[PDB]
Structure 1
Amino acid sequence: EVKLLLLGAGESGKSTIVKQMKIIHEAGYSEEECKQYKAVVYSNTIQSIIAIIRAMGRLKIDFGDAARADDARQLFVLAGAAEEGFMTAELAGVIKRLWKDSGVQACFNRSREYQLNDSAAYYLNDLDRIAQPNYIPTQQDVLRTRVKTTGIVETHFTFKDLHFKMFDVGGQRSERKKWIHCFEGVTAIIFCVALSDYDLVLAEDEEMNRMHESMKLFDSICNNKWFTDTSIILFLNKKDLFEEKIKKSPLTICYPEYAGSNTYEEAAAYIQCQFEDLNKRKDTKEIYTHFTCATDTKNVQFVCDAVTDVIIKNNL
């Protein structure tokens, strides 16, 4: 019996790690299970293009082509279907024309100035596939869905002759009061951090830098004496998004004193050191840090294989 608890701020990747355990250890999502995520995929897609369209109003960005204004009108006329798990060719055409517009793209590339699902581009770039008749979400489509977690999710799987119970909680501010309900009998905490959060602000609070929020939570959890004997695993997640972002968005937005280059290795290491330095007991408390892409099954499989070996050695 091994109890794993996933913790971290909102949208850090916790529930995506959960989905990966099903894919890796329990043979993935069945066809009926994938069909259940169809409405979620469509809902995320519609919400993402709408979120960009909303931002254009706030940021005063015009459509590149004036013909798009009528498409934008038709979007809201037809959007109701997607929410119910249906995607007509007509709605798909509207979204596709909107997504390709240079004004919409300009707004998309300023997404740090508002709140946009990380999977927006993933779904929007794949419209021809997901709009097809009898579309059934792939494992990756399922991995890419976003639903804010409320309450506590408990999942089971077997791995290396061990029976794992994995607990997942919401990370947004409204849900943090529920974390304590999960504090008993924890073998290991997997604390997830979105590396790409460094230039974002909280959905709950536009004045709070997302990564500063994550640091405060990690500081709180890592140094809590209740967890002295609980293995602390740190997943620096969304490394794929971070790799792309670091090229174009200065890390100094988050850490004014960062003097390294705009490249993956130096910046990733610097963030790791920022979190690890929050550990007030470096000689007596180890943090097991891994860089992850939670949507990437192979990456998660090898990482969690390494993590599991640590957990076995240190708690068994």
Structure 2
Amino acid sequence: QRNEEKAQREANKKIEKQLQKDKQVYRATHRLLLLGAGESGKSTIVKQMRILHVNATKVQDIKNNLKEAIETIVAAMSNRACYERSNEYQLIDCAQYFLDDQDLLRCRVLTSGIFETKFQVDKVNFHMFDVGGQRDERRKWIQCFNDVTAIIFVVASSSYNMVIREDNQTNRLQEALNLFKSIWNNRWLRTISVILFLNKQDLLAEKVLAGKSKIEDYFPEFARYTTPEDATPEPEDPRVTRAKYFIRDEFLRISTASGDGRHYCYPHFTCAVDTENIRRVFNDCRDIIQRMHLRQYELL
């Protein structure tokens, strides 16, 4: 049939025209991947970014969390003074606030599926998504994310005197360091920058202020550490400023060992509850692309 091809040739033309429209949109977006250990703040950051940029079941969710928190503290600690030694037994963070905007941020929920957020700043397309599995010892899904702009890493810096959930004899912060080392020295992630969020800064000042549970006990290298000469202690007691930079320095040691100029780590001191961190991602994302072009043409 002579007329059979004419319809098919027209069918291709309509479809091939649409692909051009999608080509421009796809090439003009930036994809950001959230990573970190469990109970760090990956969902808290993605919550406020959507609210800040884009913008009845929560009643039951709060009740479920409130009941679980009360039972664990009363029962496990039996083996006001109970909360003093709360590090020995597992406990959620939202126990004190809920029992006594911001309230909706304090809620916690477990992660199943994949959770994506779309937002635009200054007419620039951004697409940030978090990937949640109960636990994967081996990530075989990390080879798919090979063209992202940057990797956002969230780590809890007020969780040195606690122990992981799956294994009851592993230091929580030391587990976060182990995960970063494997991610950094990955065969696929050889040209991906990392943005580091040293989260939960609010609690870190509280722990150091109280005399009990000094950081020297868990990390013996803190005794011989001293504040760097190029320190900009913000506003803060000298004791707190020394504590913050010890944790930041350990992460930079691993990153600076390798990379050969294709890798960079940007450390920030955040507090995901309230700190205005929308511009922080934007400023560093323009530097990643700018450095990438500078590496080309042998200018760097």
TM-score by length of 2: 0.75
The Cα offsets for residues 129-149 of structure 1, whole Å up to 9 and x where unpaired, read as xxxxxxxxxx21221111122
| Aligned residue in 2 for 1:120 | 95
Match of 1:304 among 261, 277, 281: 281
Return the offset for 1:231.
1.8
Superposed, which structure 2 residues align to 1:99-118 within 5 Å?
105-118=80-93
The Cα offsets for residues 236-259 of structure 1, whole Å up to 9 and x where unpaired, read as 000111111123332134312212
Match of 2:252 among 265, 276, 283: 276
| Aligned residue in 2 for 1:287 | 265
| Aligned residue in 2 for 1:21 | 49
Match of 1:169 among 117, 131, 138: 131
Cα contact 1:198–1:209 (8 A) shared by 2: yes
Aligned pair 1:223/2:185, yes or no? Answer: yes
Residues of 2 paired with 1:238 and 1:281: CA distance?
28
Structure 1 window deviating more from structure 2 (38-47 vs 184-193): it is 38-47
Residues of 2 paired with 1:172 and 1:212: CA distance?
19
Aligned pair 1:263/2:239, yes or no? Answer: yes
Structure 1 window deviating more from structure 2 (206-215 vs 168-177): it is 168-177
Residues of 1 paired with 2:89 and 2:133: CA distance?
19
Match of 2:199 among 237, 243, 253: 237
The Cα offsets for residues 2-34 of structure 1, whole Å up to 9 and x where unpaired, read as 11101010011111111011111011xxxxxxx
RMSD over equivalenced CA pairs, Å: 2.4
Residues of 2 paired with 1:118 and 1:202: CA distance?
15
Residues of 1 paired with 2:195 and 2:104: CA distance?
25
C-alpha distance 292-222 of structure 1, shift in aligned 2 (>3 A): same
The Cα offsets for residues 244-290 of structure 1, whole Å up to 9 and x where unpaired, read as 11233321343122125993211110000111111122662320011
C-alpha distance 189-117 of structure 1, shift in aligned 2 (>3 A): same
Cα contact 2:146–2:189 (8 A) shared by 1: no
Residues of 2 paired with 1:148 and 1:176: CA distance?
20
Cα contact 1:20–1:300 (8 A) shared by 2: no
Residues of 1 paired with 2:44 and 2:292: CA distance?
25
Structure 1 window deviating more from structure 2 (2-11 vs 114-123): it is 114-123
Aligned pair 1:37/2:62, yes or no? Answer: no
C-alpha distance 51-228 of structure 1, shift in aligned 2 (>3 A): same
The Cα offsets for residues 56-95 of structure 1, whole Å up to 9 and x where unpaired, read as 233xxxxxxxxxxxxxxxxxxxxxxxxxxxxxxxxxxxxx
Return the offset for 1:122.
1.7
TM-score by length of 1: 0.71
Cα contact 1:150–1:175 (8 A) shared by 2: no
Cα contact 1:52–1:116 (8 A) shared by 2: yes
Residues of 1 paired with 2:164 and 2:141: CA distance?
19
Return the offset for 1:108.
1.3
| Aligned residue in 2 for 1:251 | 215
Aligned pair 1:198/2:160, yes or no? Answer: yes
Residues of 1 paired with 2:120 and 2:138: CA distance?
28
Percent of aligned pairs with the same amino acid: 47
Aligned pair 1:50/2:71, yes or no? Answer: yes
| Aligned residue in 2 for 1:78 | none
Residue 226 of structure 1 aligns with an amino acid whose one-letter code is W
Give structure 1 stretches of 5+ with no counterpart: 28-34, 59-104, 126-138
Residue 31 of structure 2 aligns with an amino acid whose one-letter code is K
Higher relative contact order (CA 8 A, sep 6+): 1
C-alpha distance 264-176 of structure 1, shift in aligned 2 (>3 A): farther
Q: Specify which structure has the higher proportion of helix.
A: 1
The Cα offsets for residues 187-216 of structure 1, whole Å up to 9 and x where unpaired, read as 110011001111110011110101011001
Return the offset for 1:106.
1.0
Cα contact 1:219–1:278 (8 A) shared by 2: yes
Return the offset for 1:107.
0.9
The Cα offsets for residues 124-168 of structure 1, whole Å up to 9 and x where unpaired, read as 22xxxxxxxxxxxxx212211111223322221112322211121
Match of 1:155 among 117, 128, 148: 117
Cα contact 2:200–2:271 (8 A) shared by 1: yes
